[PDB]
Amino acid sequence: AIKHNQQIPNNHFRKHWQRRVRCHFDQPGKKVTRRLARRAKAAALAPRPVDKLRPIVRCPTVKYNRRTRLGRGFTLEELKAAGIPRLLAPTIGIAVDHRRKNLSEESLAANVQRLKDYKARLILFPRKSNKPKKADTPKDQQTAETTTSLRTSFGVEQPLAPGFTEISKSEIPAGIEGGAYRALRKARSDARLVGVREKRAKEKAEAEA
Amino acid sequence: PTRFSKTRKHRGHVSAGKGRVGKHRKHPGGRGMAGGQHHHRTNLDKYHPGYFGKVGMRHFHLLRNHYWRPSINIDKLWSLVPSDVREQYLSGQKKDTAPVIDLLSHGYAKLLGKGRLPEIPVVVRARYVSAEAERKVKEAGGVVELVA
RNA sequence: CCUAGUAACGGCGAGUGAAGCGGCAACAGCUCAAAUUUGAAAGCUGGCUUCGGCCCGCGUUGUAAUUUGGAGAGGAUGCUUUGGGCGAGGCUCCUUCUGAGUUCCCUGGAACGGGACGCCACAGAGGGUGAGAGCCCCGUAUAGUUGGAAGCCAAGCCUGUGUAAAGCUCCUUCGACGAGUCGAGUAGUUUGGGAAUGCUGCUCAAAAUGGGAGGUAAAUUUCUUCUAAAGCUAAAUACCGGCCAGAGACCGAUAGCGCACAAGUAGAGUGAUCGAAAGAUGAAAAGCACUUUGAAAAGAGGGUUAAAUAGCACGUGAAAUUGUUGAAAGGGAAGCGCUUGUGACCAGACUUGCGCCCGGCGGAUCAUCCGGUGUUCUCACCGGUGCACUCCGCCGGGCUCAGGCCA
RNA sequence: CCGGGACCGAGGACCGCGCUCUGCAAGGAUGCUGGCGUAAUGGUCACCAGCGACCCGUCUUGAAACACGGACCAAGGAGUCAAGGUUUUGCGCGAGUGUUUGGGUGUAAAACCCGCACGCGUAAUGAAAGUGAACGUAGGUGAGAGCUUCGGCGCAUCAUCGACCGAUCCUGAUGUAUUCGGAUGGAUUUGAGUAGGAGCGUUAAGCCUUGGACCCGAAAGAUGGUGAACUAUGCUUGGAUAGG
RNA sequence: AGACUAAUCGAACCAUCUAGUAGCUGGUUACCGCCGAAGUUUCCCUCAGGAUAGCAGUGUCGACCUUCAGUUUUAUGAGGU
RNA sequence: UUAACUGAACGUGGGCAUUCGAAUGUAUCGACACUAGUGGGCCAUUUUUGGUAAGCAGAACUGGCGAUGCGGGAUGAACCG
RNA sequence: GUCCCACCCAUACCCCGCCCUCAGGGUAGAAACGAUGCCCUGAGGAGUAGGCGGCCGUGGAGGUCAGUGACGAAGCCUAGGGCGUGAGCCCGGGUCGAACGGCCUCUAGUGCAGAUCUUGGUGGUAGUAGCAAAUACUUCAAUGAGAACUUGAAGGACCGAAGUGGGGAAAGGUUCCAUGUGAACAGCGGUUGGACAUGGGUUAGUCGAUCCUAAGCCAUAGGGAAGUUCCGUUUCAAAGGGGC
RNA sequence: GCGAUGGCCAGAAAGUGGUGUUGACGCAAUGUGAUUUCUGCCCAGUGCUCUGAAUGUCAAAGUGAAGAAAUUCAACCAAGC
RNA sequence: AUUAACGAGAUUCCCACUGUCCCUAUCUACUAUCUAGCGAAACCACAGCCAAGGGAACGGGCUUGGCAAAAUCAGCGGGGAA
RNA sequence: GUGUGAAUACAAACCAUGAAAGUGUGGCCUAUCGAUCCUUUAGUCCCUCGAAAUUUGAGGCUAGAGGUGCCAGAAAAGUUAC
């Protein structure tokens, strides 16, 4: 029953909503529980970092196309280029994704470098102390300052391109011959008429023959 | 705070401010939007003209990402460069160097042109550009180039 | 969390209503069918056994090894990789022990109250004790300490080894992949799903670069992306029903759960089921000995107690209604408003204050000056100097001014 | 121009207007005198007297009503809370604004600190493909508070004539993938627009909607269970009813 | 005979959905101060009810704008009781 | 628009106050925001319709009761002050 | 009927005092002020439905009065006093026994005469209606505080074998017997009792149950149903017992 | 009305039931109401029932034609009417 | 349409009989009534004498008059629109 | 000062009539009529089917018609003497 100048209401409160209400009075209590779980997990993994290595990935939509972020794992081609066995990768903190492909060469080159320098920073303790092996650390540089986050130390350096660039005058390029605005209109109408133009040209060839 | 509200001032007065002849019954007139075409028409036409009917064609499974292109006018173009560098250009100290502005990195796709521009050459890189905006940036010595 | 009250559905009325992207919490991957071990069923339930094994049975209509699309098989090629046993030290659980006044005086039945003087504090959370206790008692704070049991984690050492098994780099060629299922027509239900989103019944019933999906039905030609009809698996999430624990700007015996009590009890109904009322003597029973009237219940004396104006009908004991004593009114209602009168009872105010003059008593100290200190820097305090016509307190006498109520 | 009576005394240094001018009746009461200093004046309660006075609450044009509820007393007893809107008040920042989904930290459900995204705002208009805001010191004219060198400049807002962007209807230049392209100039048309930004978070009050919704109240409808110890009909097995 | 089916029958009794809905009856709790109404217009399966305009209160801003008026006078029009 | 710078609207410049060109009042100027109650009415003078008539039914201008006590009509929502 | 003198009284009109509301002025080289204060001047006051402002009380929370109290806190009674227009606040006397207030902010399950309101308690009517079917009681003695309704004896009556007699089925569950007894119950009394208290009492090879079947109910073989379960009783079953 | 491959009737279904240990002198469904004396005219309307040459009307499936296809158009066509 | 027998079925008349009536009178038992003991309920705004007037058009209360003397027992059915 | 019906005065086009000025946007004036949703026809040669083309089919934008007489517009037969 409207009586005055009102906004037409739409309140979805005709079911038995009172039976399903989820108040959050345990917001601080839950936070304490997670912090107790993190430090308990970090204690179990005494010298190891808590997290795992991730690759650099670009967002999939025309909006968000500009920004980059972390992915799930390295493709099987990325691991091969850096000379890491497939089975050994998951057991030294590296995350592997077997259902991703490298269509371009920019993404392939960026991830290989990001993975190659990690291999140089790795300290690998031997399986048995009394008998070390060829690939083990020779015990001289086992004592050094280490990192544990691996998400802040290996995060995205810069997600977006630089805001602007400064270049000297007389280096500014010349635009398209027609102009920027008219270059768009011509390119739009060319795709609209791709079908009409194509059949008219083709039927002319058969008409003359 | 209930200590100061009109229900506390109604104590001792019968009918609690709702009237004697009209007694504030349960639901006179119906519930919700009842009577839109029958007895609430006079209210629904003085205000809200256009509630009933169909207009236009329908779209199945609309994805709003296909239609993302925020726009920026031309008089705010100089506000993108940082303040310290900005004052140098307006003061007239460079005289030989031009800035290259990347609209996409700031979150824009189309460059509209609404205000005025000072006579300093610039370079603008945009996905879309208006017809009037291209002329004003060009007569200042600059050029706009599509970037996709 | 956002997308979003959005695309869409709807007598397009009332109303209803998702998903992809994006930030974060939490992260972990895998084994079967389809191949001939064919130079050796290499595999397993059960029974007996001296503990080394033996016997029957299941099974060739297929039990182990080998392979799961990320591949893989079959060939090339040189390097590399792989077993057992100890183990300081550290962490969880229970259990031994932990600082300081009953000092002095007053009120009281009893200090845990008031006053004076002390002490402890990584302990002034809480409760008890004859009234508000840090030091009377239990506990409370801190790391250690006595003793004991069983699992984890793990620094670093001591010893076998290639018949076997495993990983990487390249290639001409090979490369098995789930059927009354997918899909289509029709019917009912359902969904935001719209020439039909999912599900189920009936009829028809596939293929090998095949097949499904690409949110408008259909034909022709291209393109993108995954691999259905077999299976397993921790964490982030829900919940106060069960066993435990810690808390509150929550209720305070008609409140809070129906139940603070021998409460799902007493009681009602043939039955399914319905279902109450009811907390408090005192610090301690010290719960009234003995005498006397009465058939008895009980009464009157006399006792216990700080109190019986606390006596098992017991803390405090309001109103409706009732009894006795005292005061008053009443010719078919009573009550009530304005204004006097009579009788009863009662709060205020007033009962002196200031000033001047004379006389007497008692005291140190009024003006002034010097030294020290403070401060608003020109105004004061303290020490000294005064030494009686000055200054201050009291008493006696005289005079002026003002002060309560009604006229 | 001279008599007689009643009721009242507000204010609290001087100032003023005046006059009959050593003073005064002129912007508000002073002077003299007596009795009593307590139940005397005054106040509370009970009763008699003169005058006045129908029982409250409620619906109703009209209630003291032969209209309805109420024998009496004590405790209980009715506009609340959440999400979403809207205008107004206070506060912080301001072309920006919002720490608390989450992370760091802590004397631990408190307090303090950090940032990527995101929401609303900064640009509209069409069903849609789409396109997208300056002729002028951001315009001209009439009023405008305030300021001013006195000539003038003129905020907020009101009226009026124009200019610019989108839609709708006309006109169709140079050019050319010869059918594409849409310049320029118009039109008693149209929009929740431009024309030197005003918004975001929070606090308090009124009002609105769906929810038990200010409190108490139907005759019905639906899901699942318990009854033939009364009474109705039938079945198996028993019993009872003088003398003419 | 619409009779009887546990004092219940023109559709038994018990628990739940359920605090079922009501344009219709009844009630709705301290004091003082200032302002102060309507039963009329239009639409509705509308006539015991709602929306809409009017009458009413509060919060203000623009000027103190010299503007205004349920009135008279003077000049000039309309009407068919 | 006219045969026509002849008209038409809107304008620059200039001229006209010594008196801004009827009375009375101005104890109440203009604009905006949000919202309550009400939407059963009844009585009287003059005009007036249906009806034999009615403390009956239906209208127009204005004043009253409702929402309101006080002094007169002995009494009496509406009459006189 | 007409005309003329005097007089009587409304909350209306005139003058004065006081309260509140509204409007217009004065107050800093501050010897100054709950500046929300104080001083000067004028006009106005009816009101249901309804609107807004200011204030008073109740239960809790933060701060502060270095607040009151066993030499008596809170509560209750009181024709005993003071303050406010009013809701209300404050003191004296009596009773009682362990906690409780003022001031500025915060918070809400926050104020009662009504709803044939909810639970508990108590009145008038009132020592009133009434305790009247089934023919009926009387004399002496004993017991006892007390005898119409306890016991013995002697008279008078009733039920009158389809009984008020003598035994059982259903149902009840100690009501059966003895000794003793204050209150409560036996709608009057009570020494008496089917009431109260303490003890005691029910013996079977032959009487019944146990055994057999009737109407009827339920397993098995099998078939239905998503399922709790429905049908089926010799049925489309490899269904048993006797001797040495 | 009915000769068991059946009539009337129960059940969600069933290798399920009642009449039925039954067979027209029987089972099942209706109206009138002892005996005596009688029971007339109407098949237009509403029901019930019988006979399919008639082609009128006519569903799904099936058959034919057009189209690149979805699809559209034609004949044929049970019971009932 | 008739109909013997039958009926706690409806109706009219005649004989017998009578307190149904003219027209009322008397007697008996158990109550009512008084006393001892025991001892409730409905209902109730406050209450209880009338005549006229006006008023919501039929008052116990208002206006104008009539009037009006403690405390009580047994009966009664006009009013309390019981 | 919303809708529907009906009505008045101009503007920009194309025409009728008359020698011409002029008159004409239905009937000399006051009545003679109808929303949302859905269907159907006319119009431009226009926009969409959201992985890309070409033809069918479907959906949009502007103006008419199919109708609500309860005419600001629900789809609707009786009985109760239980």
Ligand SMILES: [Mg+2]
């Ligand atoms: Mg009021």
Ligand SMILES: [Mg+2]
């Ligand atoms: Mg009311």
Ligand SMILES: [Mg+2]
């Ligand atoms: Mg209303």
Ligand SMILES: [Mg+2]
């Ligand atoms: Mg309608």
Ligand SMILES: [Mg+2]
């Ligand atoms: Mg649907």
Ligand SMILES: [Mg+2]
């Ligand atoms: Mg739904």
Ligand SMILES: [Mg+2]
């Ligand atoms: Mg995500």
Ligand SMILES: [Mg+2]
């Ligand atoms: Mg074995």
Ligand SMILES: [Mg+2]
């Ligand atoms: Mg292998």
Ligand SMILES: [Mg+2]
């Ligand atoms: Mg060890």
Ligand SMILES: [Mg+2]
């Ligand atoms: Mg200790």
Ligand SMILES: [Mg+2]
């Ligand atoms: Mg002592």
Ligand SMILES: [Mg+2]
């Ligand atoms: Mg002490």
Ligand SMILES: [Mg+2]
């Ligand atoms: Mg204690």
Ligand SMILES: [Mg+2]
């Ligand atoms: Mg203690």
Ligand SMILES: [Mg+2]
């Ligand atoms: Mg001490």
